[model samples]
Target: TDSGEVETFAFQAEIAQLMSLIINTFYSNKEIFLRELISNSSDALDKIRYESLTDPSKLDSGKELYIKIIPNKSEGTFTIIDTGIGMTKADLVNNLGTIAKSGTKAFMEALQAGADISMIGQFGVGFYSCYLVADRVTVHSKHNDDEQYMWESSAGGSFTVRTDHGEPLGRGTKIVLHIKEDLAEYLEVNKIKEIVKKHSQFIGYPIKLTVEKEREKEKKKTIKEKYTEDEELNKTKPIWTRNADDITQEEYGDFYKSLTNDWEDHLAVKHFSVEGQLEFRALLFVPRRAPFDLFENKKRKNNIKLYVRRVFIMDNCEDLIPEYLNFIKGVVDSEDLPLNISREMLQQNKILKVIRKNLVKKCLELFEELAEDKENYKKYYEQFSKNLKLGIHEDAQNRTKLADLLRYHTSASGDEACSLKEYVSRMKENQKHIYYITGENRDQVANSSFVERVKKRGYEVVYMTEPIDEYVVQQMREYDGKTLVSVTKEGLELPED
Candidate 1:
């Protein structure tokens, strides 16, 4: 509808049902609504970037592409603007009005079929998530080939579209959210900043945040001048995508803090690129301290963020790493991984198996280097040893490497720890197996009869105190061909003395 004309229509039944599902289903974690919208904007920018390869004019007007987020505190509104591809009237109707006709119906059927709720993100329903916070949303869009049009929706049964006489965007789209009373927190700068950093920090394009800052004054501080500036929130150059030589220790530390919201310096950094068969770039960090929620949350996904060609896919993609490595935080950017219809896939992906294998190998390599520093490695081990044990129990392919990294207190070493290699090095002549004892803690295990007998024979007994240690030792029955003998077990068969 151009030339100042306006029109309105009822939403299709399928569209109505889909809207109802989104409004009521995921309403609890409604803050992810920002993530979905930002992702949609990134996809739009990517589309224009790809299209501009053949036709440069598609982006010539505003070649510098970025997404701008502004919080209008005075008006109780939040807006996101992008200079990427704009939409036409046809696009507004086809993309927004009916959701591509069959797409919504397919979504409905999938819901009825009892498909996992997480799978709903694949069907291009991201825009509708806006209703979770905003009772009304206004999309102001301008296209290179069509008149500027606006789509206004109130999350009611229908929406309205019309040609706009207001200031033109010249290129891309602008979304303004009329903040709901309950979600007015979204209109605050601090809250918006936190959400942006949490979800959209790794987005490929620049995300600018507009905020008012107060300036320092000499003596008249009571009347200090306040000014506003648009700060770029997203780091444009993904450290993982750059060469290791170009990045410094401080840069890596700064990035680690940015990625994990952890204040302490990273224990170590690993930057490497793989080529030939499968290509990917990784920038990994070992945190100085394990997260407080580390072992408590078994359902916790990996913190390794996955990206395909610099576009963020997901941070919780368990396919990228084993459960034990969830403490490792960083980015994995792949050139060969395919982009899904929307964003991340937490379920098993075929291409991720090889990527996971290489990543685990690399992660182990970094930790092996960490183990060389006796003092620091002890601190790291104290924090993350439970995770390594869990890995030994679950990962069979690399159980040997994982077992080699394990360290535990021994009866002979007092409170000091010894590795399996060290234990084997100290084994007496003709010693055929390694003996160990498991208990709730080191004090209990040190006083146990099982440990006392092994220590009396001039052989060291490794103390396994952690909850995961017993299960892990059971799984790793042998290390370097030496069978693990549990002294507490009935069948504690050892070589004839």
Candidate 2:
């Protein structure tokens, strides 16, 4: 092998182009590099761990698998070490150096062709993200099939690969990032822990952070001792993966707090395990307050995270829920689904469609339950009734179910919101239409002469305040065979009294 000499080569044009895109364009947030790197590590670990089972292992006979982060302040560096399947020189070059023509093309086409997409380490950009924060990165990897090798790059369109001439990692990959001056904050262990727990806490691996933790000692009476320990940062336990009956409300609130970073406890947690062919466990939350940017971004999609066998597949799997229900944040894990279902496969597949159907139904049911409490329901309606109304307009298949969840403030109940079903139940004898009036607010509608006349006749006039109310009422047309009439509209026919 070339007299055991180190080899150097320029990165292919595409790889270099993508590297520049990644550093300058790909990610808006620099912290995504940590998420990508950790996700890739998990993929590698999953690959090897699965390999040990299916293909049988040579170097990795023992099974103490985990990821470790070591921050060196003195060296101005940070390292991510994983007990995963290490790479040969060729594997390193293909994975980290350059993207192969057939491989890259196939992957791009697979995403287009609706192929099963699994494994986070498949993308070239994910690995190159390290260059965003680090000026130089040294990758030390050892595979069971080949001798340990080291790959070093400075994002200068070239990388050098050499046989590692030091103590080997035995069977894993260790990356040392030469931290940039401005990005020195990443060298803090606490920062690293925060990033890890934020992005990869639910990752199916114990990500241990070795830190110098201070402890109080009773021996010295109010004296504290400093000790270094490997603190496991990720619980890797997704609450949605657990049974509904076994989990408590406080636990659900804690999980939601961690998942969405919402300071307030959720109004409700809808936990369900659907049975039949397309089985999945879904956990959704109703937030007490609307997100600041809920409607601000057109590109924002709050689709649920999809996982296959506890391995995270995609976070923005839009097919799992309708766009109207984007405010519902949660997870849907399916044993029947492929580990790597592609983006193209999302809306085109039956499994995802079924999941969407069930999830929407579950959300409507959650709202129905939330509406039981008058004051809390009023607050929820103020924040998310628009979503329910949006669902009524968009989801024609679930129109009836969504109509049942719709709430209206009537003159009879003054300002309190009541469901369409409740209004239907309390309708006057021989009442053929559900009468509602569109206006700016409660006072505006109640003050209107048409609604005033209707109220004088002992007919309940539903007050439609929000702009969306008019559109929703028009779309729904009628509920429970009773037509919804707008007092604001012309040519109203009254009963023959």
Candidate 3:
């Protein structure tokens, strides 16, 4: 094969069909082709680096591990190269040829069933996405033990593989795409950079792009200047990966602002890392104010962004946190879980259950800490008290913790809010139940006969003024061993000891 005899092979009957669907039907947003390519490069770089830990000989000396993107506008070609483990001739055939022997059938079935095309990456067939913009694709690869090989495909029905005698890639893969005439925007430097930043900004490997610029000399003489400078694209470090002690409040606030375009600093934040059975790091933020559509936007309720090994996976990862904590803005990066490809189908894996439990506990703990400052907690309560009430109604396991975090104005404390624990501590000696009154507002509840009657016994009555408060108290019929007695009820009997 090294003698330069090109061998052509037909794709599997199903693969030809899949390729057609991928190119013609599946992808609506064509720019994802770049993201899929860069992700593959990143994975290859990670594999080679990890393999070098056991076999030092696998490391290619003087070759730094990186991914580079080069676009040629005149030639209408875009290329991506990686200094990672390159595939051998057989590997190129088996790996690229077969897609996934077992998964391809499932993928074909899914597509025929009208599955969402955005999930193509999860199926591990992201490579075929090249055909979305390219009319012809060429792959040149070199491995340590094998000679260089070239794989070319116009994605019609078959592909050709032959020995490459060109300049050595040193130990890596180089992919060149002959851009379609209508999709020439992919050949633009700025457009490629923007796509890379939007999708792969946090990829662990250094993603470099060849940047070309022009400058004019004195005397008003303008000349076409083409100097190739490799500009590193993914520069922002994953904030969750750093030690909490090393990060300042300003840095956390800046990160929050970047995740969400909110203009205000976060009201509170929790930075934590878990070890042992499950290992992951998280950063959570309580917004200064709730979004206008907080309750209305059912689909975008959870704002936690999910990441695996610094690569952006998805946003509004609802499974990472419960609905009651949907107001939280944060990032959860997992080191233990495999990148399970589907955006909607991250599998109700028990690992996610563990992560969700930890996240909810941490959020409650953050609220507890914030409650230490009465004034600040009052401000937060004004914005999100309904959510906590919902937590009490929905989360039975954390009911006690959520109950302790609740605040309400009482007959004893006129304008100030008091906790259930404080209300319990101030209970009258003979009182056997916690008393409460419900109405629309403090003014309405304060003037009600229920409050007037409970006041005669010098017992404190909680003001359940919010609409959801009625349901919350019903869910928590008793708090701290004392039954909750509603003053507005028909058969309300004040228990006397």
Candidate 4:
């Protein structure tokens, strides 16, 4: 094998600073390096597949697309290989050498401004995450139009690229990471499999890991030897891509468990696809109970994972769902949106806006279905009643729909909760307004002077015990053509008839 003269280049000033920050500052969640790399491989696979659509010859070298994880315990290295669109010599320098021009600049600025390390995931420099677990990294790639080339870097001041005459990798990339002494766990097959399952399980292509095990033979005094075979790591299918009619309740429950790790079954599920003007598929699950940190982390409320063409892009996509619907656990895979260079942050365009609108609509539709079943709706209300109240205040376009889903204890209903529609049906013949009273609790509100006066008139007054309940009513002045008047307010009208 002949090797051409190696040409080395100095790391851009920002690249040097960025590498140091990733190495020193990103102390927590170092395991994400595997996820970032796997995501990159998926992006490459998507590209090759897409290119093949226009030009059939692009896939002439090979059509099989998959990512392989190989751990070398003896060599203290971890490798990830993908049979996707490979990069040429110049492509390597431009894509991996300097990172994305604008992306790295913005990343540096965000870091200097003391942004949270997690926010770094939104920037396109996920490739730099490799520095977190490895002391050095090498990439060897082959593009159909260009010869194979190898790019090596030590996260130092410089990196080298050179022509390679070794056995050609028909078409794809191979990344070898020299595991740092302190981060040797990356070379463990179990750890690699666990990481892949957590972050890349839904990747479209198969992720195969080389598994080596000891085998004993009964013959020749039971000699023991080691054998190796490729074991697939991600077995869970992307259920969102399947036809809704073909999916079963058990499959949905299992997918929900794998997605959220929630022990209880989801309260409701919404599987929908939008075509024509916008193209996307979504599978949303409403947990039977609220997440422990649902209200604690206001900034990180949305749990909707955004995927582009089956490649997991990012989690907690704030733009994908409204804050009030943050309780929704789901995945939205779009075919229209283009993944920005790094495939980290979305481009923030009309596509996301459309997807967000559709998601909110589907979720409300799911709630309406749940409301039909009184017992199940009540179970859902107990866990996420406040969230709906917040939605009524925040989402004006869907306020009426959200209001219809609300339930509260009324004067006539005792401890049981009733919807506004039900209250309207039971109103006195000449009643002109839907009445309600707010206080610290149902007991206090039920016994208030306002409630007593409303009860004297034979009008059922809704109880506003939760803090957000009053705000919601204030925003929604009427429901079912009846004015939502507070009984405690001085202007409460008595029937003149």
- Return the lDDT, model 1, position 105: 43
Q: Alpha carbon lDDT of residue 382, candidate 3?
A: 87
lDDT tens string, model 3, 1-497?
56787788986556547667656766657877887787677667766776686688878553577777778777887777888778887677777776543233443564475432222234556777788888999898988778889999784778899989889877888999998999787777677767777777777666667543434453775554556545544555644557877778877777777778767688887888899987788878888886688457666554777776566666756666777877778778765566544322355578888888888888888888888887899999888888888888888889888888888887768789988899877767777777777767777766666566555666677766567787776788778898877765634554555
Each candidate's TM vs. the true structure? 0.68, 0.67, 0.78, 0.69
Model 2 weakest 10-residue run by lDDT:
339-348
Writing each residue's lDDT as its tens digit, candidate 4 over 392-478 gives 777779888887888878766888998889987887666677667776777775666666665576667776667777566678877
Ranking by TM-score: 3, 4, 1, 2
Assess candidate 2 and give its lDDT: 0.69
lDDT of each: 0.71, 0.69, 0.73, 0.72
Best by lDDT: 3
Candidate that scores best on TM-score: 3
Higher-TM-score candidate of 3 and 4 = 3
Q: Model 4 segments beyond 4 Å from truth?
A: 1-67, 80-185, 211-232, 276-278, 294-299, 349-351, 438-459, 485-487, 491-497
Give the Cα-based TM-score of candidate 2 against the true structure.
0.67
How much lDDT does candidate 4 score? 0.72
lDDT of 1: 0.71
Residue by residue across 1-497, what tens digits does model 1's lDDT show? 45787789987556557668767774457777788778767767876776677687666678888888767777777788887667887788776776534233444564465432222234556667788788789999988778789999794778899999999888999989898887787776677777776656667677766443433555543653444435556544553546677677777787777677767678788788889877878888777766776457566465777765454556665656777777777778776655543455534376678788888888898888787899988898888777887777777787777877877787678889988888888887677778777777777756666655554566677777667775666687778778877766654535456
